[PDB]
Amino acid sequence: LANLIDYKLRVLTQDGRVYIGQLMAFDKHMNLVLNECIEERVPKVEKRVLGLTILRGEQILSTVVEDKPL
Amino acid sequence: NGIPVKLLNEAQGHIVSLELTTGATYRGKLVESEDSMNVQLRDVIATEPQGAVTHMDQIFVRGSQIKFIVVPDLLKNAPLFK
Amino acid sequence: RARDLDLNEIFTRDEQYGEYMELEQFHSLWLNVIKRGDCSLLQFLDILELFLDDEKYLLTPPMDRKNDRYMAFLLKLSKYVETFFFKSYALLDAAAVENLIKSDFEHSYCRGSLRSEAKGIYCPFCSRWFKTSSVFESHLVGKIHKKNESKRRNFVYSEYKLHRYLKYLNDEFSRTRSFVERKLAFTANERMAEMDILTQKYEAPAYDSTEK
Amino acid sequence: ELEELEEFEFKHGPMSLINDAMVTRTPVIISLRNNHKIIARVKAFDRHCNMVLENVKELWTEKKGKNVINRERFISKLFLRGDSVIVVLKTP
Amino acid sequence: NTLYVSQLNEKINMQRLRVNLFLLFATFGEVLKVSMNFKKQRGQAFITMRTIDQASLAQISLNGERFFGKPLKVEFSKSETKTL
Amino acid sequence: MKFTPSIVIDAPQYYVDHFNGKYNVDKCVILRDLQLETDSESMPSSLKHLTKPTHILDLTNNDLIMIPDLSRRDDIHTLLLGRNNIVEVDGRLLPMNVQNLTLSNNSIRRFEDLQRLRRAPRTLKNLTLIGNQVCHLANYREHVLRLVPHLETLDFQNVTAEERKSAMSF
Amino acid sequence: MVPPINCIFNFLQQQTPVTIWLFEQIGIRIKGKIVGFDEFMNVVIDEAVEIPVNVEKGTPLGKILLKGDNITLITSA
Amino acid sequence: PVNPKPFLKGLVNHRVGVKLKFNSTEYRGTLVSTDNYFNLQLNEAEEFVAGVSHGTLGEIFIRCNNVLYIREL
Amino acid sequence: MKLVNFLKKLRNEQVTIELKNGTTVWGTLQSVSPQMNAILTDVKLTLPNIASLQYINIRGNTIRQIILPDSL
Amino acid sequence: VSTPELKKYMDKKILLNINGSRKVAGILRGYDIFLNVVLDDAMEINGEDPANNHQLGLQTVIRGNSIISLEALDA
RNA sequence: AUACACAUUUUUUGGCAGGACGGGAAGAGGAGACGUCGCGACCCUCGCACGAGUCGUUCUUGACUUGGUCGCUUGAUGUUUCUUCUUCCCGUUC
Numbered sequence A: 001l002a003n004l005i006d007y008k009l010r011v012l013t014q015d016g017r018v019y020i021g022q023l024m025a026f027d028k029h030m031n032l033v034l035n036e037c038i039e040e041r042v043p044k045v046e047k048r049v050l051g052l053t054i055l056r057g058e059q060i061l062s063t064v065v066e067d068k069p070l
Numbered sequence B: 001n002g003i004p005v006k007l008l009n010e011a012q013g014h015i016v017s018l019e020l021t022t023g024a025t026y027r028g029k030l031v032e033s034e035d036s037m038n039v040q041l042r043d044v045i046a047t048e049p050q051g052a053v054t055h056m057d058q059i060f061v062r063g064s065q066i067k068f069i070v071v072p073d074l075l076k077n078a079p080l081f082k
Numbered sequence C: 001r002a003r004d005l006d007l008n009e010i011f012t013r014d015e016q017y018g019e020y021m022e023l024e025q026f027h028s029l030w031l032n033v034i035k036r037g038d039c040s041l042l043q044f045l046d047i048l049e050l051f052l053d054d055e056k057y058l059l060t061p062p063m064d065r066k067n068d069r070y071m072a073f074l075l076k077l078s079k080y081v082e083t084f085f086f087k088s089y090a091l092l093d094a095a096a097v098e099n100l101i102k103s104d105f106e107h108s109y110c111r112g113s114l115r116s117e118a119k120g121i122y123c124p125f126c127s128r129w130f131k132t133s134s135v136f137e138s139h140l141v142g143k144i145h146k147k148n149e150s151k152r153r154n155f156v157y158s159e160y161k162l163h164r165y166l167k168y169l170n171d172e173f174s175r176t177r178s179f180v181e182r183k184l185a186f187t188a189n190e191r192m193a194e195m196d197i198l199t200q201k202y203e204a205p206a207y208d209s210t211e212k
Numbered sequence D: 001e002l003e004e005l006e007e008f009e010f011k012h013g014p015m016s017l018i019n020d021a022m023v024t025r026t027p028v029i030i031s032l033r034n035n036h037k038i039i040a041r042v043k044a045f046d047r048h049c050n051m052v053l054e055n056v057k058e059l060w061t062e063k064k065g066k067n068v069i070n071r072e073r074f075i076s077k078l079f080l081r082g083d084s085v086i087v088v089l090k091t092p
Numbered sequence E: 001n002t003l004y005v006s007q008l009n010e011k012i013n014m015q016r017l018r019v020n021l022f023l024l025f026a027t028f029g030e031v032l033k034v035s036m037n038f039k040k041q042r043g044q045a046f047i048t049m050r051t052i053d054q055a056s057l058a059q060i061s062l063n064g065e066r067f068f069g070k071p072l073k074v075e076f077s078k079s080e081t082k083t084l
Numbered sequence F: 001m002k003f004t005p006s007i008v009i010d011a012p013q014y015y016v017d018h019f020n021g022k023y024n025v026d027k028c029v030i031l032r033d034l035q036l037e038t039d040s041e042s043m044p045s046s047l048k049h050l051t052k053p054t055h056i057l058d059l060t061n062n063d064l065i066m067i068p069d070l071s072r073r074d075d076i077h078t079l080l081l082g083r084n085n086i087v088e089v090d091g092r093l094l095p096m097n098v099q100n101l102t103l104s105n106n107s108i109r110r111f112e113d114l115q116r117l118r119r120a121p122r123t124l125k126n127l128t129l130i131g132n133q134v135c136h137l138a139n140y141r142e143h144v145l146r147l148v149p150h151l152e153t154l155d156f157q158n159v160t161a162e163e164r165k166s167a168m169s170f
Numbered sequence G: 001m002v003p004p005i006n007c008i009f010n011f012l013q014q015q016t017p018v019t020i021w022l023f024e025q026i027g028i029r030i031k032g033k034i035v036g037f038d039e040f041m042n043v044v045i046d047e048a049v050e051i052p053v054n055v056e057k058g059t060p061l062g063k064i065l066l067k068g069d070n071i072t073l074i075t076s077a
Numbered sequence H: 001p002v003n004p005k006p007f008l009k010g011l012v013n014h015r016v017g018v019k020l021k022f023n024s025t026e027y028r029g030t031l032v033s034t035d036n037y038f039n040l041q042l043n044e045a046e047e048f049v050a051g052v053s054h055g056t057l058g059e060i061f062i063r064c065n066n067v068l069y070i071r072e073l
Numbered sequence I: 001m002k003l004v005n006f007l008k009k010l011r012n013e014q015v016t017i018e019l020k021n022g023t024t025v026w027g028t029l030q031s032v033s034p035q036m037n038a039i040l041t042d043v044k045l046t047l048p049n050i051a052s053l054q055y056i057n058i059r060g061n062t063i064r065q066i067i068l069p070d071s072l
Numbered sequence J: 001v002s003t004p005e006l007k008k009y010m011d012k013k014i015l016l017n018i019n020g021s022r023k024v025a026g027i028l029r030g031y032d033i034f035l036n037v038v039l040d041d042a043m044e045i046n047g048e049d050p051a052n053n054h055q056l057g058l059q060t061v062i063r064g065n066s067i068i069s070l071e072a073l074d075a
Numbered sequence K: 001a002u003a004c005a006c007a008u009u010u011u012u013u014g015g016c017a018g019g020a021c022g023g024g025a026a027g028a029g030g031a032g033a034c035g036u037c038g039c040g041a042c043c044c045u046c047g048c049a050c051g052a053g054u055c056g057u058u059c060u061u062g063a064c065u066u067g068g069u070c071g072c073u074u075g076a077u078g079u080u081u082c083u084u085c086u087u088c089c090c091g092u093u094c
């Protein structure tokens, strides 16, 4: 997971919503802080710019490498 | 403690937005954040999944119930880049 | 010219570039087909052996050759064996082989290629024998045989292919069956180390920095 | 001492079903939370009811545009999480 | 490296203004600025450019260009951009 | 000279300002997925090594004659075509969700040459033709509106129902 | 202004009939007397009754050990 | 104090039935044993779904987590 | 003992993980965390139409079951 | 185990919203490490419109794990 | 550089249940709330700095405080209740 740091990553939430943002830090619970994170729902349609977010590890399903870091 | 917990403690005194497991959104000034993610919030504007919006003075939600928070970008500078 | 050519995208690890053919998967599907568990990997291979014979797979079928599940399975398996065959022998003209088999199918197989001194002439499509060649010929125009040859053509042909391709691969079939028995008679540590070996062979450069 | 007491409690407790399953190599059927069922032999288990199962046959129930049909498949080497377990039945 | 533009139709939303500005000024060189910091519109946009020659070329070539109904006025910024 | 994959691999690749993502194209010349600027691109080709991760394509300052030879790119939203010599447009462009096209300062002469832009389904919201000879021809604006009503903003001016109706009247 | 465990303890002593609201279930709620509890809030409840709200009926269950996880809201009636 | 653990120990070796949170399944059988985390082992078990007998399961294990309550029968 | 260690042994193994949400995963285990968080490469993934992904990390609690090779 | 800093809320009337879209109102009595709460003068607000005084003085207990959130009616 | 992570806030869970297509328009027998971000403008407003504002020391850092409104003249979107045909044009496929 440490390798994934600073990358643009795609997390899938527990509710099916897809979040995309830079991975700044993690923790034990897999709580993630995502910089410049935006939300996509259906697939672009229904995209919103959230900004800096924490996500809770209890909600996270999976993560995948989206793009390289800024 | 978690590094994100440390950030969230830095977020105190700022305006944050919270989405809970129900889906309601609470925007307002975060008074206090415990290690367990329990948060005390002020002057909250709430938007329900139906779209209805309410105002409330003081709100305190359990950590476990929070889906996610958005905090201001001021904090993004440091010291979590390390 | 072929710098982006990769065998691992053509062969699975259990096939070891043509050393073995992975039939465990088909053993699974087979269990699903027979609707039980009385069938072991080795008993399944024992079943496959039928298709090395020119008559067994026809006159001593594992299941009734008009069963759906069975015919579907046989299709999938046949396809696998064929692709494996040409996959493991790139250098031989695929089209040549294909046409050879097809012509053998048309000129002999469907022409009473299976003959018995007692029962006469067997027909793959109707699964019946015939006294003499005469009644056999006048049966190849009958509404029955028309129906069958018109419905079960693809299956019959696929069966046949499974037959001849498995014959051409007898050495690989035996090699694998052997492998099965070996792994089966291993211990835990043994089986583990062996798997390690197959893996290494799979993810190793085709040319070592230390070759002559 | 503590380890001993843990293994013993495990032995005479409800776990005795899955312990018995591994030692006898007997088939057991597992009702899961996915509304799928797994009949198999117990290769290994865990305090969380994490399991390694062999000769797996999972049965399930599917609805279509007509009568409900049961569907089933064979998975020879199956590892299973411990929270999916609703119930583990041991039977002749 | 940064150019100060003003006299623009403020009726355009922020994100569309920024996307059209980046679009228009990409012809001279890479625009480094992602977003208008000033968040007040009324023309007052700053465009940051990686090389200086692209800033000068944009300034001379796009003076008084009709952009969303209005001829834009372009000048060099008083101070250096934080990102530079 | 040619846009080839060897070039595709190693240009200044980064994220747009707009946070639009991409991976750029410069072994010695013309680029893609970011800054396709100033390396004398004659004909677009070999977009496949772009392999889809790109929101934007800054083609400006090349010698492009026409816009064909676009592999299927789902991700590409913005094309910055400025300062080329685009005479014609392909037609079967249809890269779904191409929202923005920048034709500024090119050489598209005829109204009819603009026809292929109608194919862009409902995504081509922003199109800028300013700097072309076709702009001078009579009823240019109205013909673009009647031809591609999908455009929401033309030449950085917004469509408006008034000239939509005038475009209907003629 | 008393901890909930002491509240439950006074339910224990008073032997009052108790109504529990379960988790994520509005349809049914359980009722009966608290004869004992543990640290996990599992409760032995005597003369317990299932009360479907959907006039109300119910099923007499007798003695019950109810797991504390279901517990949403413990009350007195 | 009479704790759930002693009540349950006294309930061992007795005919019981257990209603799960789902209520989709109840199990009636002899209570063989229960552990400190309260997983349940029953014998001769019978499954009652929607209050009707589904079938006779026999020696059965119940994950603690699924248990809504247990009652003696 | 701890089966999670048995998963730790499973690096470079090709597996099909069914998940509690019903999702199917297919890929080579690069590592599994003790949380049973599984990192895989060369993964085809089917949500309940397959998406092909270079690397996928999964939170362990979401994993329903993992189907291992029979050769193991 | 941490204790929730609920002292500021003590002896205040609060609207608790709870799982299952349930909502109750009552004066915050006690709490514990577990976030379990004692509420006096508890009143259930059913989904319809009426409200029932469940625990006027007898007081109720709400498991903290079920407590979605808590609003302060007073200041 | 070299024991533990199943009993309330995180990972051992309250979860489960010629033919077709796709637009856009017309003619006949989808429509109400409640929100949240956009095309235009008769409007507001009028400017270089922001994250902003001040100071100590030195050629660059450390401390301390704290688009909004109206239309859409058929813009885009998630609750949540209730009850299709025909014709013409433009794209894909065979």
Ligand SMILES: [Zn+2]
Residues within 6 Å of the ligand: C123, C125, C126, C127, C139, C140, C145, C148
């Ligand atoms: Zn015949």
